[PDB]
Amino acid sequence: MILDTDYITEDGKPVIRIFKKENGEFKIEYDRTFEPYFYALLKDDSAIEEVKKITAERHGTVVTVKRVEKVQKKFLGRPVEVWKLYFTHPQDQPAIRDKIREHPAVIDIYEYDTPFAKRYLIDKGLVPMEGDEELKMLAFAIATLYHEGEEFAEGPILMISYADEEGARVITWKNVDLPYVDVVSTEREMIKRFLRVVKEKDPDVLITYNGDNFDFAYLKKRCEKLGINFALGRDGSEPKIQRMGDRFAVEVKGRIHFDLYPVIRRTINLPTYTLEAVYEAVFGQPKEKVYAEEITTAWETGENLERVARYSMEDAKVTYELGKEFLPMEAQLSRLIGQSLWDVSRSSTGNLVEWFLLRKAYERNELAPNKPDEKELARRRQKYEGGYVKEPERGLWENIVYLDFRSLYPSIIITHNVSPDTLNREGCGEYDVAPQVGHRFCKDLPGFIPSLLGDLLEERQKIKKKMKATIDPIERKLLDYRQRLIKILANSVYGHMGFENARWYCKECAESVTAWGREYLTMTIKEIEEKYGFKVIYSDTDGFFATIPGADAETVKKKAMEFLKYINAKLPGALELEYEGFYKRGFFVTKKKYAVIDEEGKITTRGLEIVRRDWSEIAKETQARVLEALLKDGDVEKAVRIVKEVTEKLSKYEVPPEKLVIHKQITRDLKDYKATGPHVAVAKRLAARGVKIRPGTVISYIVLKGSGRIGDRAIPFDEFDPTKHRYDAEYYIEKQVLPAVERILRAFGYRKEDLR
DNA sequence: GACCACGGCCACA
DNA sequence: ACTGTGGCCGTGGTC
Ligand SMILES: O=S(=O)(O)C[C@@H](O)CN1CCOCC1
Ligand SMILES: [Mg+2]
Ligand SMILES: [Mg+2]
Ligand SMILES: [Mg+2]
Ligand SMILES: [Mg+2]
Ligand SMILES: [Mg+2]
Ligand code: NA
Structure with a gap:
């Protein structure tokens, strides 16, 4: 099993080292064949000789281009000829490259800023962590x-x-x-x-x-x-x-x-x-x-x-x-x-998709596009429409069902050959046209992005099948890890197409995929209501909750199955809708906030303050308890009872102070903040005291009994003495617990005053 | 100074 | 910095 790669110099030449673990033994493979390179595009192949005679400096030693090779590759799915510039040492190309880029007869250079050991793993088709070799x-x-x-x-x-x-x-x-x-x-x-x-x-x-x-x-x-x-x-x-x-x-x-x-x-x-x-x-x-x-x-x-x-x-x-x-x-x-x-284990998700895409692009002889310069980055500062979130039918609903589109955005990308290389391609015989945005996508030849996503989702289905057949729980979980990660990667490839820093950035592809998905969801909504008699309570982007007004539980389930078949036939390609589950009851507060209970009794909360980290545990616990009573037994009387008990405890200061801590994060240099709210204020004081508050620092503060600006009254919980401090119960009642449990109990007529 | 727009933080898909 | 959509609140700006 390959573990890592690096390179060591020897007599000036680079030597790739492959740290492996084979048959339970740590091994090191040495390769002195790999040569560093990057690609360059010329106005005239003639100037290649002038490009061969380029100089620079490193470690007091001049750096020169070793050799050139004419290679034919596809850029943006289109044929192009390109010169492959070779160099003697990897570190030679972090120099010269800007000099070559500024040459008069060059258009641009490609795949320049690629690590040598990474380039080896890619160009050699080597995959780390492949094998049943257990690790110490x-x-x-x-x-x-x-x-x-x-x-x-x-x-x-x-x-x-x-x-x-x-x-x-x-x-x-x-x-x-x-x-x-x-x-x-x-x-x-x-x-x-x-x-x-x-x-x-x-x-x-x-x-x-x-x-x-x-x-x-x-x-x-x-x-x-x-x-x-x-x-x-x-x-x-x-x-x-x-x-x-x-x-x-x-x-x-x-x-x-x-x-x-x-x-x-x-x-x-x-x-x-x-x-x-x-x-x-x-x-x-x-x-x-x-x-x-x-x-x-x-x-x-x-x-x-x-x-x-x-x-x-x-x-x-x-x-x-x-x-x-x-x-x-x-x-x-x-x-x-x-x-x-x-x-x-240390890279961002947007950088992981770049490694994946560059590997695939090398597999397809696709000249990897460079990164956006500063001017194009501002040109890429464009906005497009996204999902369709409906104003939820606020309140409590009974015997409801959620239907989801399996990998909606990836399915769209594959079904319609959505990709930067298949966009407005003159001379094709088959075009799928995108709604609202009017972008034409060639389907004569499969595109880069659709090919990758297609192969990927094919693997995920294969992986799940072997998993359900695999008997070693370890091996099973390994397969389960791959199928989940494959799904994350697929949807992440769409984000790459919208990422300004991405090399394969096609805003057209993005807004087309969003528009298509909006259309498919809308039609599904119209059909499940008009043709099958349902009421769509809420929908975000890839699914929706719905029920039949005053319906038998088993009736909703059966009639739901029928709509799946009807809609799937009308749904093009691999775009499918599926039955995620049935929930006895569910409360919908606002967009991106709800909670439902399965027939066993498991409650799934989303968006509601119970899941937020920037909220006191006392508010989260209380909101949860209210949600349980309503979604499990409907004892709204118990719900308001719970609120009153908690509020009284906070009034009598009998609530453990640890439940009153608010956790917020500093997301930038405090120097550059423009709104000194409570958390950055607490940290700014800590900064002057000596503590270095840097991006990512989580501030844990409590509000002490007092008046005025919340900031000039909050202390970090590490500086709280129960013998010398008292918390502002009013804040934790009139700004934490009540303003959350009210949003739910407002549906039943109760007001904040009615909650003590 | 009462009301409101609003950085700013986090969540859902 | 995936992106987009979205709801909040403490704070200050504004007549
Ligand atoms: O059934 S609920 O839990 O109400 C909604 C979820 O199934 C939505 N999914 C979409 C895919 O990513 C995970 C969340
Ligand atoms: Mg590059
Ligand atoms: Mg290549
Ligand atoms: Mg078009
Ligand atoms: Mg493509
Ligand atoms: Mg189908
Ligand atoms: Na990239």
Whole structure:
């Protein structure tokens, strides 16, 4: 199984290294054949000789074009001839390229900014994480001495915890009687022992939580102060750093550094992304927190160091189990995109589709379009219409059913050959014309995007079939991971066509797909009402909820099935509508907000404040309880009863303060904010106090009893003393709980005053 | 100073 | 920064 690729220079020539794991043995394949290149388009093939005589400078050594090759490729589905410019070293082409681009006889250069090892994986048709080879894993965490006002890593590393299949153990340079504690003399011996543990375990993946921005940087700073060689790589190298926009990420050559923070932030949405919070969310069991204050005090007084070690052991044991749950899926994503698990676990979704598309484009001899320049980016600042959300039939409905279009947008793209290369193509014999936008799509030849999406969705159906037949639960889940990810990728390819930074950006294709989908949904609505007698309560973009006014439950189900068959025949191509489920009752507040209950009793809430992270748990809990009473038993009397009980508890200040915390995120440099609301105000004060509030910082504030601007009255919950503070129950009643439960109970006549 | 437009944050598809 | 559609609220601007 391929794990990663990179390249090392040797006598000036590049050498690709393929880190594999075959038959349970770590192997390194060396290739000295691959040559760096990019494509260039000339007004006249004549100037190729003048293009051969181009110069530049790197490391005091002039860089020249090695050779040229005339290659014929298809750009935008159209034939074109292009010169392939070869170079001696990969780093030569980050130079020269701007010089070539500015040459008079060149039009543009293509596939220039492509990583050499990535280009190898693509051009060689190599797929990471392919095989039944199980991987050895090891999760490590650190515990450091923190003193305020000091620089980074001024204090020492107190403990180094690691966890694997055998268990969790902590290495520390002080005496603790905990059985999982190995005691050493100095921080140097602690680090040294950790490297020995890694070296002897030869781990394939190293699981860290936020290790890309802390654990490895702290370990590096200490290994430089104490004069250690942090040779954690299988090639005998130290963890290398690579920039990732504002922040950085660390690689362990010959291994895969799996930082769980970016993966978990992307996959799950929670109010706060603390390790303890992530654990109790994914596994249901709480994890105790020991703050740096307690840690430093315990180390300096030598008292209660056992508890600090327990935190370290857990911090690692949970990191392993979390990684064990999130690695197989991310490995299958790596298999799908054709890039290393390291890169896919840290890259944005819009960048993953670029890797996938560039692989496919190489498979189809399609010259990959470049990225948008600044002027075209502004030219791409255009807006098009999207889905059709109907003003919901607000209130409570009974015996209802949701019908959805399976992969609506992808089905449209394939059915009508929707793609930038099949748009207004002069000289075709078959054209499908897009509603409202009037864009003509050639169907004589299948398009790039439709071909990819077609092959993809074909695989997903195949994958689901093998899954339902597969007997190993592991293998099954692997297949289940692929089918879900295939669906995400397909719909993401549509977003690429609308992404300004995307290389295959066709606004026409986007608005055409939206228009088609609007049409298909509208007709379905008209037919299910006029021809079959239903009332559409709500519809967003790819489906709708509906029922027959005063209908028997089983009647709705049966009559619903009939409309599916009727509409599917009238539905062109693979555009199908399907029966997601039946719900006894459901409340619809407004667009993008509702909740329904299955016949078993499971409630699905969407958009309602119960799912929001920027809302007090007391409001979310209360709104949920109201929703349960109504959607389960209709005890509206109990619902208002619950509201009154909660409001009285808040009046008497008997509600746990943790349920009154509002979690909001800083999305930019506080310097550039233009509306200092409560959360950015709290952080701005924290900023002056010393704390660095950066993009992504989650602020957790509470409102203390007082008056005036909400901002100049909120404190971070880490600064809340129940003995010295009192929360503004009025705010948490007249601005949190009531303004949410009212929106639901307004349908039944109750007003805020009627709720105490 | 009462009312309202509105950054700004998050959610659904 | 997938995109688009959408609902909120604390805050200040505005007569
Ligand atoms: O049945 S509900 O839960 O009311 C609505 C969902 O089925 C809608 N889907 C669309 C596809 O992505 C997941 C959500
Ligand atoms: Mg390029
Ligand atoms: Mg190519
Ligand atoms: Mg047209
Ligand atoms: Mg195409
Ligand atoms: Mg059909
Ligand atoms: Na792209």
